[PDB]
Design a protein around this motif. Structure first.
Motif, PDB file in Angstrom:
ATOM      1  N   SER A   1      -3.023  14.529   8.113  1.00  6.49           N
ATOM      2  CA  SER A   1      -2.286  13.253   8.225  1.00  6.49           C
ATOM      3  C   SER A   1      -2.831  12.359   9.324  1.00  6.49           C
ATOM      4  CB  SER A   1      -0.801  13.488   8.485  1.00  6.49           C
ATOM      5  OG  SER A   1      -0.292  14.443   7.568  1.00  6.49           O
ATOM      6  N   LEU A   2      -3.534  12.955  10.281  1.00  9.71           N
ATOM      7  CA  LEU A   2      -4.027  12.216  11.426  1.00  9.71           C
ATOM      8  C   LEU A   2      -5.260  11.392  11.070  1.00  9.71           C
ATOM      9  CD1 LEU A   2      -3.413  11.843  14.482  1.00  9.71           C
ATOM     10  CD2 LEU A   2      -5.168  13.604  14.919  1.00  9.71           C
ATOM     11  N   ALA A   3      -5.102  10.072  11.103  1.00 10.99           N
ATOM     12  CA  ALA A   3      -6.207   9.169  10.815  1.00 10.99           C
ATOM     13  C   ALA A   3      -7.445   9.432  11.711  1.00 10.99           C
ATOM     14  CB  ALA A   3      -5.754   7.736  10.956  1.00 10.99           C
TER      15      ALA A   3
ATOM     16  N   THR B   1       0.864  -1.175   0.000  1.00  9.25           N
ATOM     17  CA  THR B   1       0.000   0.000   0.000  1.00  9.25           C
ATOM     18  C   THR B   1       0.900   1.224   0.000  1.00  9.25           C
ATOM     19  OG1 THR B   1      -1.861   1.125   1.093  1.00  9.25           O
ATOM     20  CG2 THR B   1      -0.325  -0.020   2.537  1.00  9.25           C
ATOM     21  N   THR B   2       0.338   2.379  -0.310  1.00 11.69           N
ATOM     22  CA  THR B   2       1.150   3.576  -0.441  1.00 11.69           C
ATOM     23  C   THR B   2       0.750   4.700   0.515  1.00 11.69           C
ATOM     24  OG1 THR B   2      -0.278   4.400  -2.198  1.00 11.69           O
ATOM     25  CG2 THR B   2       1.689   3.141  -2.885  1.00 11.69           C
ATOM     26  N   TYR B   3       1.622   5.693   0.612  1.00  9.26           N
ATOM     27  CA  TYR B   3       1.334   6.904   1.354  1.00  9.26           C
ATOM     28  C   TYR B   3       2.181   7.998   0.744  1.00  9.26           C
ATOM     29  CZ  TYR B   3       5.727   5.681   3.711  1.00  9.26           C
ATOM     30  OH  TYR B   3       7.018   5.378   4.009  1.00  9.26           O
TER      31      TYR B   3
ATOM     32  N   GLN C   1       4.381  11.757  10.832  1.00 11.17           N
ATOM     33  CA  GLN C   1       3.503  11.430  11.943  1.00 11.17           C
ATOM     34  C   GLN C   1       4.276  11.049  13.198  1.00 11.17           C
ATOM     35  OE1 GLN C   1       1.549   8.112  10.024  1.00 11.17           O
ATOM     36  NE2 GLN C   1      -0.168   9.416   9.336  1.00 11.17           N
ATOM     37  N   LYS C   2       5.596  11.212  13.180  1.00 11.56           N
ATOM     38  CA  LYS C   2       6.445  10.675  14.254  1.00 11.56           C
ATOM     39  C   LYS C   2       5.994  11.097  15.659  1.00 11.56           C
ATOM     40  CE  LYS C   2      11.261  10.364  15.790  1.00 11.56           C
ATOM     41  NZ  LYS C   2      12.624  10.910  15.548  1.00 11.56           N
ATOM     42  N   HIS C   3       5.548  12.342  15.783  1.00 12.63           N
ATOM     43  CA  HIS C   3       5.125  12.905  17.065  1.00 12.63           C
ATOM     44  C   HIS C   3       3.889  12.220  17.655  1.00 12.63           C
ATOM     45  CE1 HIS C   3       1.906  15.483  15.164  1.00 12.63           C
ATOM     46  NE2 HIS C   3       2.675  15.241  14.120  1.00 12.63           N
ATOM     47  N   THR C   4       3.098  11.583  16.797  1.00 11.21           N
ATOM     48  CA  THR C   4       1.863  10.945  17.226  1.00 11.21           C
ATOM     49  C   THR C   4       2.090   9.511  17.705  1.00 11.21           C
ATOM     50  OG1 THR C   4       1.164  10.204  15.005  1.00 11.21           O
ATOM     51  CG2 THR C   4       0.517  12.421  15.692  1.00 11.21           C
TER      52      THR C   4
END
Ligand SMILES: *[C@@H]1O[C@H](CO)[C@@H](O[C@@H]2O[C@H](CO)[C@@H](O[C@@H]3O[C@H](CO)[C@@H](O)[C@H](O)[C@H]3NC(C)=O)[C@H](O)[C@H]2NC(C)=O)[C@H](O)[C@H]1NC(C)=O
Ligand SMILES: *[C@@H]1O[C@H](CO)[C@@H](O[C@@H]2O[C@H](CO)[C@@H](O[C@@H]3O[C@H](CO)[C@@H](O)[C@H](O)[C@H]3NC(C)=O)[C@H](O)[C@H]2NC(C)=O)[C@H](O)[C@H]1NC(C)=O
Ligand SMILES: *[C@@H]1O[C@H](CO)[C@@H](O[C@@H]2O[C@H](CO)[C@@H](O)[C@H](O)[C@H]2NC(C)=O)[C@H](O)[C@H]1NC(C)=O
Ligand SMILES: *[C@@H]1O[C@H](CO)[C@@H](O[C@@H]2O[C@H](CO)[C@@H](O)[C@H](O)[C@H]2NC(C)=O)[C@H](O)[C@H]1NC(C)=O
Ligand SMILES: *[C@@H]1O[C@H](CO)[C@@H](O[C@@H]2O[C@H](CO)[C@@H](O)[C@H](O)[C@H]2NC(C)=O)[C@H](O)[C@H]1NC(C)=O
Ligand SMILES: *[C@@H]1O[C@H](CO)[C@@H](O[C@@H]2O[C@H](CO)[C@@H](O)[C@H](O)[C@H]2NC(C)=O)[C@H](O)[C@H]1NC(C)=O
Ligand SMILES: *[C@@H]1O[C@H](CO)[C@@H](O)[C@H](O)[C@H]1NC(C)=O
Ligand SMILES: *[C@@H]1O[C@H](CO)[C@@H](O)[C@H](O)[C@H]1NC(C)=O
Ligand SMILES: N[C@@H](CCC(=O)O)C(=O)O
Ligand SMILES: [Ca+2]
Ligand SMILES: [Zn+2]
Length: 875
Positions: A732-734, A131-133, A240-243
């Motif tokens: 970016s936050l799901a 899958t991609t992002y 997203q590293k901070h999350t």
């Protein structure tokens, strides 16, 4: 081509289950993905312990193809002559007939079967896939596996049953720009080309195939160290590293808590977690490499809600439990799946409760698992905890409320009855006894029976080998009798046939004037028992700790209503939730007059606690939905319940203040006010929404969902719908994305909802993992109720082709029909089902939603006048 399909049935390969005489020992597995091509190849060598003469060797394989003639080897090491290979589709086998037969595995020598295979990485969320992002405008790739329950056989040829435990040494050949992950640490990395790398992992402990996992990724990482000294790391997109911070915290805390609690070392040198950008379930406990949907792992304190926080903590804890219950000890067969899922669903609360102190988690079990599943298990179309499953579709179907919630609930009752200390020490013994092997339910009773010498097997079998649960009927304050509780009063209570005849051994607890007592209510006491001074009121089943309902005499119920009106605090928050829950379920079942149930809601202007409000909201939501188009009853139910929540809604306000539970309360209480048509609550929603549309203001995190929903519903239009769709793509936050999708589903516009449904076919816009979530959101829309329903019908062939009938979420999508309540709607359902009678994993869901809709029709017939009278007379 090489191993063609054959319809040859004269062999043991016609049997659904693998043969007894073949046990793999070790897997040598190598895979090489061509990421940009959406293909992979691999070779697997399997050491095999053979116990009986056979001219055929067979194992599981689906979709993925064998590319070269398989190669067999004697335990001495000589190469075995192979006549043919063939696929047997009906039972998902690839079979090789040897010339010879011989039966040795007498020494330490084993047969060696080597297979070359090729598969696809596209069109699917199971097996091995890509899958991609997007990162800094570039499209990036990640590949991973997902196997539970019967998809390891899509990744590679294997003995794909939970009790065929083998050891694993995995290697992957990947482009050098990529890292490679698996269950075990990295052993060695060697350069194939100047472009390719071969990553070999160290040998695994013996484990089940569904737990085998590998991934190819360019993720950054956040790191922590256990008390054990072992690295616990969460892999996460750099953006997203901070999350990943919060999940890292909880992993540490809950990992350390469990290791001590179970008195057992985590079996591997490291533990990794990673959220795949498109992921088919909530999460998967792959040993050492736990995979997530981003919504269950990634949390931003500045953007995510308290609800999100708790979900992250709970799923993390859940997956950690499996490192012991499920991974170290695995069920022998899927019929005992609850040994995995029920335990994880139980201990997840203990884990999070250690990590987060003021979350009242133990009480929240009632809201999360106990009370919701008492609804499920009151249908005829429920099933016992120990479930006969004979196909892959049946196997995957039982990943349900029964395995998870009823499993959790009967363990909660068991713990309380047997005492925490003894339940703990009992779990430990079970864990050391069956380590790296498999257990049955009987094996667990015996273990605990050593910790208590109480009749565990005798008592717990009644809760486990038959569906359903009892209602306790109270005669004369003190005498109780048991009877099966079914929501449908027309249903035959003896069906389906049960050897135990739908009577239970009930551990019964009650409070006499702040003093608690205990009795085991025995099945053989056919005429009930008497509860052992000078009493005017008995509180039976405190905190709803036992998995049953209590029907007090009507006089007592009346006295409870009055007691609540005078001083509701005389009862604990849990006891209030429980009494309210039972009363409305009893009224639903025609076991208690609705007036008696409704009388319990009169005090509510003074109710301030989370648990009771939640179970009230649940009860009213059903009743209100049954009267949606009754212009006589609906405004009255609305006016009243709006009046009842208004004080607490007003008191908490539209602002994030207070502790965890308060913030959760505010969400649901403000949500219910909106739902009941409170003008001031809807105005707050529209005002905040209007501000959010101005593109700067960051909404209070626990109000966001409500504002997107009721804001869109009351003042949304094409301009704000389009804006909200853009915002959904840009974040970016799901967890934010998911709220925005609910917002988009809330617009009162057929044209916009039609555009939305069309987007489901666009994988650039809606992820494959999110399609059923969106359909369900749309079905909640007063227009979308029928739109979602029509769309899944019109597009059924499309969905089946996209997801396959083995997909659980697709099977369950028919439950969007739950609120249906007319003969016309029921006929629509039956007509659709008759047209597409191959239901796959949807077989049970179909049965359940039909029973529900038939109950609704009956419910309306039986109760419209009584409920109308209660409201009219009051108003
Ligand atoms: C968001 O919701 C709030 C309620 O939770 C609204 O605030 C309330 O506004 C009401 C009227 O504007 C006030 O109620 C009554 O107002 C009448 C006016 O005629 C007075 O006589 C009464 O004294 C008053 N009632 C009482 C019991 O004092 C509320 O006082 C007021 N505040 C609260 C906490 O309820 C907001 O207006 C609303 N926000 C938006 C943007 O719509
Ligand atoms: C448990 O529920 C009972 C059944 O609804 C309650 O008894 C009812 O109380 C109503 C008041 O809420 C009464 O309605 C009033 O009386 C007559 C009805 O015929 C009307 O003219 C009045 O207008 C109406 N009052 C108002 C303000 O509109 C009912 O008479 C009465 N019903 C019966 C069958 O007795 C119990 O009060 C309740 N028990 C509790 C709360 O403990
Ligand atoms: C992954 O993509 C390949 C190639 O695009 C798909 O294979 C095609 O399958 C269809 C049948 O539905 C054929 O008409 C094509 O000719 C096939 N092409 C090739 C090259 O084999 C494959 O089905 C996709 N995989 C999944 C799981 O959907
Ligand atoms: C993860 O845990 C740490 C504590 O180990 C949290 O602590 C933060 O940092 C300092 C110093 O440790 C504390 O005084 C604060 O209470 C914390 N807050 C902030 C904003 O830095 C950290 O917050 C936790 N991670 C989360 C919640 O994501
Ligand atoms: C629902 O949404 C549609 C689409 O936006 C609305 O129809 C538009 O109305 C605007 C303003 O009246 C016109 O400029 C456009 O020509 C229309 N667009 C389309 C695609 O038809 C419609 O009015 C809305 N329906 C409601 C509010 O009931
Ligand atoms: C809102 O979004 C839609 C989709 O981007 C806009 O575009 C029109 O969409 C329909 C399909 O629903 C197409 O048939 C038209 O060709 C699109 N118009 C274009 C590309 O100019 C729509 O214009 C947007 N409306 C507002 C008010 O922003
Ligand atoms: C309850 O059971 C006891 C003991 O069997 C009996 O004496 C009594 O009459 C029963 N009924 C009531 C209303 O207490
Ligand atoms: C229920 O009755 C049977 C009588 O055979 C007994 O074996 C069982 O232990 C009883 N349970 C009790 C008294 O808790
Ligand atoms: N065991 C996983 C679900 C895996 C699956 O059903 O595919 C969970 O409940 O978190
Ligand atoms: Ca799976
Ligand atoms: Zn699980």
């Amino acid at each position: 081509d090489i191993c063609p399909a054959s319809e040859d049935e004269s062999g043991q390969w016609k049997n659904f289950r693998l043969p007894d005489f073949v046990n793999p020992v070790h897997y040598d597995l190598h895979v090489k993905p061509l990421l940009e091509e959406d293909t992979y190849t691999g070779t697997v060598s399997i050491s095999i312990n053979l116990s009986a003469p056979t001219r055929y060797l067979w194992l599981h394989l689906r979709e993925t193809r064998i590319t070269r003639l398989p190669e067999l080897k004697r335990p001495s090491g000589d190469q075995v002559q192979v006549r043919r290979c063939f696929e047997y589709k009906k039972q998902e086998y690839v079979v090789v007939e040897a010339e010879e037969e011989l039966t040795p595995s007498s020494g330490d020598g084993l047969y060696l079967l080597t297979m070359e295979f090729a598969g696809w990485l596209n069109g699917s969320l199971v097996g091995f896939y890509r899958t991609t992002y997007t990162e800094n405008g570039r499209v990036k790739s990640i590949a991973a596996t997902d196997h539970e329950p019967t998809d390891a056989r899509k990744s590679f040829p294997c003995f794909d049953e939970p009790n065929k435990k083998a050891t694993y040494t995995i290697s992957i050949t990947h482009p050098k720009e990529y890292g490679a992950l698996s269950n075990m640490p990295v052993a060695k990395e060697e350069s194939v080309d100047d472009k390719w790398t071969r990553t070999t992992f160290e040998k695994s402990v013996p484990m089940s195939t569904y737990l085998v996992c590998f991934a190819v990724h360019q993720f950054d990482s956040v790191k922590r160290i256990s008390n054990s000294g072992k690295p616990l790391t969460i892999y996460v997109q750099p953006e997203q590293k901070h999350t990943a911070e919060y999940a890292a915290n909880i992993t540490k805390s809950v990992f350390d808590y469990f290791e001590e609690y179970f008195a057992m070392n985590y079996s591997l040198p490291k533990l990794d977690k990673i959220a795949i950008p498109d992921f088919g379930t909530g999460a998967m406990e792959n040993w050492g490499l736990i995979t997530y949907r981003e919504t269950n792992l990634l949390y931003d304190p500045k953007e995510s809600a308290s609800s999100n926080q708790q979900r992250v903590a709970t799923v993390v804890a859940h997956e950690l439990v499996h490192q012991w219950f499920g991974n170290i000890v695995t069920m022998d067969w899927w019929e005992d799946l609850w040994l995995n899922e029920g335990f994880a669903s139980f201990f997840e609360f203990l884990g999070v409760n250690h990590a987060e102190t003021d979350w009242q988690m133990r009480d929240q079990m009632l809201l999360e698992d106990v009370l919701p599943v008492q609804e499920d298990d009151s249908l005829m179309s429920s099933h016992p905890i120990i479930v006969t499953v004979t196909t892959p579709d049946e196997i995957t179907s039982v990943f349900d409320g029964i395995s998870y919630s009823k499993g959790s609930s009967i363990l909660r009752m068991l713990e309380d009855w047997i005492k925490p200390e003894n339940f703990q020490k009992g779990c430990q013994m079970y864990l050391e006894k069956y380590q790296f092997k498999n257990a049955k339910t009987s094996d667990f009773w015996a273990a605990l029976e050593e910790a208590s010498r109480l009749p565990v097997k005798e008592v717990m079998d009644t809760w486990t080998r038959q569906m359903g649960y009892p209602v306790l009927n109270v005669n004369g304050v003190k005498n109780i009798t048991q009877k099966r509780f079914l929501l449908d009063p027309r249903a035959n209570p003896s069906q389906p046939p049960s050897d135990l005849g739908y009577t239970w051994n009930i551990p019964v607890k009650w409070t006499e004037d702040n003093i608690t007592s205990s009795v085991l209510f025995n099945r053989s006491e056919k005429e009930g028992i008497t509860l052992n001074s000078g009493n005017a009121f008995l509180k039976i089943n405190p905190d709803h700790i036992g998995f049953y309902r209590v029907n007090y005499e009507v006089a007592t119920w009346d006295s409870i209503a009055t007691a609540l009106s005078l001083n509701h605090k005389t009862f604990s928050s849990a006891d209030r939730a429980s009494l309210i829950d039972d009363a409305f379920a009893l009224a639903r079942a025609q076991l208690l007059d609705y007036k008696v149930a409704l009388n319990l809601t009169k005090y509510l202007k003074r109710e301030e606690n989370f648990l009771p409000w939640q179970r009230v909201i649940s009860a009213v939501t059903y009743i209100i939905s049954m009267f949606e188009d009754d212009k006589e009853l609906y405004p009255m139910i609305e006016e009243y319940f709006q009046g009842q929540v208004k004080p607490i809604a007003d008191s908490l306000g539209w602002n994030d203040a207070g502790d965890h539970v308060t913030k959760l309360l505010r969400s649901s209480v403000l949500g219910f006010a909106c739902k009941m048509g409170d003008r001031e609550a809807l105005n707050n929603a529209s005002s905040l929404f209007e501000q959010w549309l101005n593109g700067t203001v960051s909404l209070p995190v626990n109000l966001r969902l409500l504002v997107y929903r009721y804001g869109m519903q009351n003042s949304g239009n094409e301009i704000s719908w389009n804006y909200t769709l853009e915002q959904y793509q840009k974040t970016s936050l799901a967890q934010e994305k998911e709220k925005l999708l609910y917002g988009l589903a809330s617009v009162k516009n057929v044209t916009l909802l039609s555009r939305y449904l069309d987007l489901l076919k666009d994988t650039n816009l809606i992820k494959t993992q999110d399609v059923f979530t969106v359909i369900r959101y749309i079905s909640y829309n007063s227009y979308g109720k029928n739109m979602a329903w029509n769309w899944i019908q019109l597009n059924w062939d499309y969905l089946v082709n996209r997801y396959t009938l083995n997909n659980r979420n697709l099977g369950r999508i028919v439950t969007i029909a739950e609120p249906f309540n007319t003969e016309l709607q029921l006929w629509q359902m039956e007509s659709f089902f008759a047209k597409y009678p191959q239901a796959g994993a949807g077989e049970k869901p179909r049965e359940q939603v039909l029973e529900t809709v038939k109950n609704n029709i009956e419910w309306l017939k039986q109760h419209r006048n009584t409920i109308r009278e209660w409201f009219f007379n009051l108003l």
